[PDB]
Design an enzyme around this catalytic site. Sequence first.
Site, mmCIF file in Angstrom:
data_model
loop_
_atom_site.group_PDB
_atom_site.id
_atom_site.type_symbol
_atom_site.label_atom_id
_atom_site.label_comp_id
_atom_site.label_asym_id
_atom_site.label_seq_id
_atom_site.Cartn_x
_atom_site.Cartn_y
_atom_site.Cartn_z
ATOM 1 N N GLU A 117 0.809 -1.218 0.000
ATOM 2 C CA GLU A 117 0.000 0.000 0.000
ATOM 3 C C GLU A 117 0.844 1.271 0.000
ATOM 4 O O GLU A 117 0.401 2.316 -0.473
ATOM 5 C CB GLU A 117 -0.945 0.012 1.205
ATOM 6 C CG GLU A 117 -2.081 -0.999 1.126
ATOM 7 C CD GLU A 117 -3.153 -0.608 0.122
ATOM 8 O OE1 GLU A 117 -3.117 0.535 -0.382
ATOM 9 O OE2 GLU A 117 -4.034 -1.447 -0.163
ATOM 10 N N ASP A 126 -6.882 5.614 -5.508
ATOM 11 C CA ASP A 126 -6.320 4.269 -5.434
ATOM 12 C C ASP A 126 -6.535 3.511 -6.740
ATOM 13 O O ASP A 126 -6.946 4.092 -7.744
ATOM 14 C CB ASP A 126 -6.933 3.491 -4.265
ATOM 15 C CG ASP A 126 -8.408 3.197 -4.466
ATOM 16 O OD1 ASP A 126 -9.089 3.986 -5.155
ATOM 17 O OD2 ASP A 126 -8.888 2.176 -3.931
ATOM 18 N N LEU A 135 -9.080 3.873 3.142
ATOM 19 C CA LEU A 135 -10.178 4.439 2.369
ATOM 20 C C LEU A 135 -10.808 5.614 3.111
ATOM 21 O O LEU A 135 -11.026 5.550 4.322
ATOM 22 C CB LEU A 135 -11.234 3.368 2.077
ATOM 23 C CG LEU A 135 -12.448 3.770 1.237
ATOM 24 C CD1 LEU A 135 -12.022 4.154 -0.170
ATOM 25 C CD2 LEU A 135 -13.473 2.648 1.205
#
Length: 416
Positions: A117, A126, A135
């Site tokens: 990530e 993303d 998120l």
Amino acid sequence: YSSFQVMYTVGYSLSLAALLLALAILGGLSKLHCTANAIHANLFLSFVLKASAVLFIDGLLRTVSTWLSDGAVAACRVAAVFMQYGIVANYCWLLVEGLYLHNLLGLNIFEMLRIDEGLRLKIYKDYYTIGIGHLLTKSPSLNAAKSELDKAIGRNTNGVITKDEAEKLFNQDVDAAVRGILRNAKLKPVYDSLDAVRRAALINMVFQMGETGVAGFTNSLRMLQQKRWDEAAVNLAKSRWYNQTPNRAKRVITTFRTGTWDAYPERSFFSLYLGIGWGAPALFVVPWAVVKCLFENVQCWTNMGFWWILRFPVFLAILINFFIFVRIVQLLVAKLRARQMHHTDYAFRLAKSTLTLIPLLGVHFVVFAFVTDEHRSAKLFFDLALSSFQGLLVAVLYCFLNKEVQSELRRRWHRA
Ligand SMILES: COc1ccc2cc(-c3cc(-c4cc(Cl)cc(Cl)c4)nn3[C@@H](C)c3ccc(C(=O)NCCC(=O)O)cc3)ccc2c1
Ligand SMILES: CCCCCCCC/C=C\CCCCCCCC(=O)O
Ligand SMILES: CCCCCCCC/C=C\CCCCCCCC(=O)O
Ligand SMILES: CCCCCCCC/C=C\CCCCCCCC(=O)O
């Protein structure tokens, strides 16, 4: 010198036999095909090169050099180059061994998600996202995302945050993912019947696509629950999740398939290991072979064999190894204290070999370096006599005493 010659002859020949045997074992047993064993195999090869060169040179000169013939000087010089190359390659691969163990100790669900990530202190697509894969909202509006961010952090961040806040979000998201798995009816039994690494592999997917998103692979869940890792890997490769993020999905799928951290960190990271273990010695040995051929092309370029000038790259390899050694110890005692691991664990058992070999070989090389410059023959004969057995020691520590190796041998023996 007669006794000394007999002793290092027995040492290098026995080392060579043990190393070829160990190589045949690691190469012939497919379930032992991990990154650590590839590293061990290359280390084995470097010692094989050394011992082969030593035995050949010994056969050519001591079984003189002032009157060697055209074929003799050639084979002798080639063997000398291979000997120097093998010696430096030994310490460079011991260094790679320290690097691999050090990186392996640092690997967990946190580091895995941290690799897959990354860390962005500013918001990005993303869906808007910030920190480590957290998120914010699926809403196209930017202000709508910034509002959720500022509300979550409790201050006007203007879309920009600090690393501490990001990792603070990260720990929460990991906790929530694990609770989401434990609460789920179709995910919990699967998670319970799993080793720590594969558990982390499931948590990765939950962190990426949410709880229900992983809950939707029930047909693929039952397969790994039945320990059918291969077909589960194939079916996971077929999934839409693979098509959207292939590079991450490969690492996670291989984490399920192998049960190892071998996918991490990154593919072709092993090429760096190749460059250190084989290329770096070439960088020092080749130019000096050029200087030997150009200016000192006499006898057989024969310090008891090892070229003097080549101390320093080895020194470098030893120096770096020291700092790696220290760090590894710090990680070990940490993991043992937190009970994040114990002595039956693979990392610990690998540390048993690597953390003895690094000081042993390092101290031996330093002692050799000091003694050779004293201009002492007794200390040289003794240390070289014992050092001739080093290939045997490495083969024993990394292969013959290894639990997975012995387990596979017992298993193939038991099948019959
Ligand atoms: C965690 O940090 C560390 C660092 C160094 C360590 C060093 C030793 C140790 C103790 C002894 C020893 C020697 C004698 Cl003559 C007598 C007695 Cl009573 C003990 N040898 N050794 C080394 C020489 C060693 C022994 C086995 C393996 C192995 O089994 N590898 C393979 C493991 C596997 O893959 O399953 C690897 C080293 C033990 C734990 C360590 C732990
Ligand atoms: C001069 C001779 C010595 C140099 C030879 C170097 C050639 C490369 C040798 C071995 C390559 C090993 C690659 C194995 C990849 C395994 C990856 C894995 O299992 O994770
Ligand atoms: C054969 C086992 C499988 C592993 C293959 C590893 C690659 C082998 C590399 C070099 C082999 C050379 C060993 C024999 C050297 C003999 C030296 C001598 O007779 O003086
Ligand atoms: C002339 C060049 C001299 C080079 C000296 C090298 C000194 C440093 C070498 C290796 C340092 C590696 C330390 C690893 C720390 C990792 C931190 C962590 O585990 O999270």
